């Protein structure tokens, strides 16, 4: 999974299995739409792979969906918290 096998609506990227590029930028609860994407996450292992398609946001496990979806996916709390992006 995410070994060039991301959440289907993916894109090849020369930077990790995730890059947290379009990370769903809210901390745990949608209200805390504070943290910048990428910056808190910075996947050091940025080896070329697949990433969430340049179009939508990775909710969690690199499932590219709109932030609109992610705000509902909050049922399963997208919780960086410490550093669990």
JSON list of C-alpha atoms in Angstrom, two decimals:
[
{"chain": "A", "resi": 1, "resn": "UNK", "atom": "CA", "xyz": [0.00, 0.00, 0.00]},
{"chain": "A", "resi": 2, "resn": "UNK", "atom": "CA", "xyz": [1.27, 3.45, -1.09]},
{"chain": "A", "resi": 3, "resn": "UNK", "atom": "CA", "xyz": [4.24, 1.63, -2.70]},
{"chain": "A", "resi": 4, "resn": "UNK", "atom": "CA", "xyz": [3.24, 3.17, -6.05]},
{"chain": "A", "resi": 5, "resn": "UNK", "atom": "CA", "xyz": [-0.22, 1.89, -4.88]},
{"chain": "A", "resi": 6, "resn": "UNK", "atom": "CA", "xyz": [-1.88, 4.96, -3.28]},
{"chain": "A", "resi": 7, "resn": "UNK", "atom": "CA", "xyz": [-5.65, 5.64, -2.99]},
{"chain": "A", "resi": 8, "resn": "UNK", "atom": "CA", "xyz": [-6.38, 5.04, -6.73]},
{"chain": "A", "resi": 9, "resn": "UNK", "atom": "CA", "xyz": [-7.04, 8.71, -7.63]},
{"chain": "A", "resi": 10, "resn": "UNK", "atom": "CA", "xyz": [-3.29, 9.24, -7.14]},
{"chain": "A", "resi": 11, "resn": "UNK", "atom": "CA", "xyz": [-0.40, 10.81, -9.09]},
{"chain": "A", "resi": 12, "resn": "UNK", "atom": "CA", "xyz": [3.28, 9.86, -9.49]},
{"chain": "A", "resi": 13, "resn": "UNK", "atom": "CA", "xyz": [5.53, 12.24, -7.51]},
{"chain": "A", "resi": 14, "resn": "UNK", "atom": "CA", "xyz": [9.31, 12.37, -7.05]},
{"chain": "A", "resi": 15, "resn": "UNK", "atom": "CA", "xyz": [8.78, 12.92, -3.27]},
{"chain": "A", "resi": 16, "resn": "UNK", "atom": "CA", "xyz": [7.58, 10.14, -0.94]},
{"chain": "A", "resi": 17, "resn": "UNK", "atom": "CA", "xyz": [4.50, 7.90, -0.74]},
{"chain": "A", "resi": 18, "resn": "UNK", "atom": "CA", "xyz": [2.58, 10.87, 0.76]},
{"chain": "A", "resi": 19, "resn": "UNK", "atom": "CA", "xyz": [4.66, 14.13, 0.78]},
{"chain": "A", "resi": 20, "resn": "UNK", "atom": "CA", "xyz": [1.85, 15.60, 3.02]},
{"chain": "A", "resi": 21, "resn": "UNK", "atom": "CA", "xyz": [1.70, 18.12, 0.13]},
{"chain": "A", "resi": 22, "resn": "UNK", "atom": "CA", "xyz": [-2.10, 18.52, 0.14]},
{"chain": "A", "resi": 23, "resn": "UNK", "atom": "CA", "xyz": [-2.35, 17.18, 3.71]},
{"chain": "A", "resi": 24, "resn": "UNK", "atom": "CA", "xyz": [-5.89, 17.75, 5.08]},
{"chain": "A", "resi": 25, "resn": "UNK", "atom": "CA", "xyz": [-4.74, 20.84, 7.04]},
{"chain": "A", "resi": 26, "resn": "UNK", "atom": "CA", "xyz": [-6.82, 20.59, 10.26]},
{"chain": "A", "resi": 27, "resn": "UNK", "atom": "CA", "xyz": [-5.64, 19.36, 13.66]},
{"chain": "A", "resi": 28, "resn": "UNK", "atom": "CA", "xyz": [-8.06, 16.66, 14.89]},
{"chain": "A", "resi": 29, "resn": "UNK", "atom": "CA", "xyz": [-11.20, 18.79, 14.61]},
{"chain": "A", "resi": 30, "resn": "UNK", "atom": "CA", "xyz": [-12.06, 20.87, 11.50]},
{"chain": "A", "resi": 31, "resn": "UNK", "atom": "CA", "xyz": [-12.26, 24.01, 13.69]},
{"chain": "A", "resi": 32, "resn": "UNK", "atom": "CA", "xyz": [-8.46, 23.80, 14.16]},
{"chain": "A", "resi": 33, "resn": "UNK", "atom": "CA", "xyz": [-7.83, 24.49, 10.44]},
{"chain": "A", "resi": 34, "resn": "UNK", "atom": "CA", "xyz": [-4.52, 26.00, 11.60]},
{"chain": "A", "resi": 35, "resn": "UNK", "atom": "CA", "xyz": [-1.45, 23.89, 10.81]},
{"chain": "A", "resi": 36, "resn": "UNK", "atom": "CA", "xyz": [0.12, 24.36, 7.36]},
{"chain": "A", "resi": 37, "resn": "UNK", "atom": "CA", "xyz": [0.31, 21.10, 5.34]},
{"chain": "A", "resi": 38, "resn": "UNK", "atom": "CA", "xyz": [3.73, 19.43, 4.67]},
{"chain": "A", "resi": 39, "resn": "UNK", "atom": "CA", "xyz": [5.65, 21.50, 7.32]},
{"chain": "A", "resi": 40, "resn": "UNK", "atom": "CA", "xyz": [4.47, 19.53, 10.46]},
{"chain": "A", "resi": 41, "resn": "UNK", "atom": "CA", "xyz": [4.66, 16.15, 8.66]},
{"chain": "A", "resi": 42, "resn": "UNK", "atom": "CA", "xyz": [7.82, 16.35, 6.45]},
{"chain": "A", "resi": 43, "resn": "UNK", "atom": "CA", "xyz": [8.18, 12.70, 5.39]},
{"chain": "A", "resi": 44, "resn": "UNK", "atom": "CA", "xyz": [12.03, 12.48, 5.43]},
{"chain": "A", "resi": 45, "resn": "UNK", "atom": "CA", "xyz": [11.78, 9.31, 3.28]},
{"chain": "A", "resi": 46, "resn": "UNK", "atom": "CA", "xyz": [10.76, 11.44, 0.25]},
{"chain": "A", "resi": 47, "resn": "UNK", "atom": "CA", "xyz": [11.76, 8.73, -2.26]},
{"chain": "A", "resi": 48, "resn": "UNK", "atom": "CA", "xyz": [9.89, 8.85, -5.59]},
{"chain": "A", "resi": 49, "resn": "UNK", "atom": "CA", "xyz": [6.50, 7.07, -5.39]},
{"chain": "A", "resi": 50, "resn": "UNK", "atom": "CA", "xyz": [2.73, 7.82, -5.70]},
{"chain": "A", "resi": 51, "resn": "UNK", "atom": "CA", "xyz": [1.03, 10.70, -3.86]},
{"chain": "A", "resi": 52, "resn": "UNK", "atom": "CA", "xyz": [-2.59, 11.92, -3.55]},
{"chain": "A", "resi": 53, "resn": "UNK", "atom": "CA", "xyz": [-3.54, 13.40, -6.95]},
{"chain": "A", "resi": 54, "resn": "UNK", "atom": "CA", "xyz": [-2.67, 17.08, -7.54]},
{"chain": "A", "resi": 55, "resn": "UNK", "atom": "CA", "xyz": [-6.34, 18.02, -7.22]},
{"chain": "A", "resi": 56, "resn": "UNK", "atom": "CA", "xyz": [-7.58, 16.83, -3.78]},
{"chain": "A", "resi": 57, "resn": "UNK", "atom": "CA", "xyz": [-6.34, 16.42, -0.17]},
{"chain": "A", "resi": 58, "resn": "UNK", "atom": "CA", "xyz": [-4.96, 13.36, 1.56]},
{"chain": "A", "resi": 59, "resn": "UNK", "atom": "CA", "xyz": [-7.39, 12.86, 4.43]},
{"chain": "A", "resi": 60, "resn": "UNK", "atom": "CA", "xyz": [-5.16, 10.33, 6.28]},
{"chain": "A", "resi": 61, "resn": "UNK", "atom": "CA", "xyz": [-3.83, 7.14, 4.60]},
{"chain": "A", "resi": 62, "resn": "UNK", "atom": "CA", "xyz": [-3.16, 8.99, 1.30]},
{"chain": "A", "resi": 63, "resn": "UNK", "atom": "CA", "xyz": [-6.80, 8.76, 0.17]},
{"chain": "A", "resi": 64, "resn": "UNK", "atom": "CA", "xyz": [-7.09, 11.82, -2.08]},
{"chain": "A", "resi": 65, "resn": "UNK", "atom": "CA", "xyz": [-10.52, 13.34, -1.34]},
{"chain": "A", "resi": 66, "resn": "UNK", "atom": "CA", "xyz": [-11.74, 16.96, -1.18]},
{"chain": "A", "resi": 67, "resn": "UNK", "atom": "CA", "xyz": [-11.15, 18.81, 2.11]},
{"chain": "A", "resi": 68, "resn": "UNK", "atom": "CA", "xyz": [-14.99, 18.87, 2.00]},
{"chain": "A", "resi": 69, "resn": "UNK", "atom": "CA", "xyz": [-14.83, 15.07, 2.48]},
{"chain": "A", "resi": 70, "resn": "UNK", "atom": "CA", "xyz": [-12.06, 15.32, 5.09]},
{"chain": "A", "resi": 71, "resn": "UNK", "atom": "CA", "xyz": [-14.24, 17.64, 7.24]},
{"chain": "A", "resi": 72, "resn": "UNK", "atom": "CA", "xyz": [-16.81, 14.75, 7.36]},
{"chain": "A", "resi": 73, "resn": "UNK", "atom": "CA", "xyz": [-14.06, 12.12, 7.69]},
{"chain": "A", "resi": 74, "resn": "UNK", "atom": "CA", "xyz": [-13.55, 14.01, 10.99]},
{"chain": "A", "resi": 75, "resn": "UNK", "atom": "CA", "xyz": [-15.79, 11.19, 12.34]},
{"chain": "A", "resi": 76, "resn": "UNK", "atom": "CA", "xyz": [-12.45, 9.30, 12.13]},
{"chain": "A", "resi": 77, "resn": "UNK", "atom": "CA", "xyz": [-10.57, 12.43, 13.42]},
{"chain": "A", "resi": 78, "resn": "UNK", "atom": "CA", "xyz": [-7.67, 13.47, 11.18]},
{"chain": "A", "resi": 79, "resn": "UNK", "atom": "CA", "xyz": [-5.52, 14.00, 14.32]},
{"chain": "A", "resi": 80, "resn": "UNK", "atom": "CA", "xyz": [-1.89, 15.19, 13.83]},
{"chain": "A", "resi": 81, "resn": "UNK", "atom": "CA", "xyz": [-1.85, 15.98, 17.59]},
{"chain": "A", "resi": 82, "resn": "UNK", "atom": "CA", "xyz": [1.81, 15.07, 18.16]},
{"chain": "A", "resi": 83, "resn": "UNK", "atom": "CA", "xyz": [2.79, 14.06, 14.61]},
{"chain": "A", "resi": 84, "resn": "UNK", "atom": "CA", "xyz": [0.23, 11.50, 13.34]},
{"chain": "A", "resi": 85, "resn": "UNK", "atom": "CA", "xyz": [-0.82, 13.34, 10.13]}
]
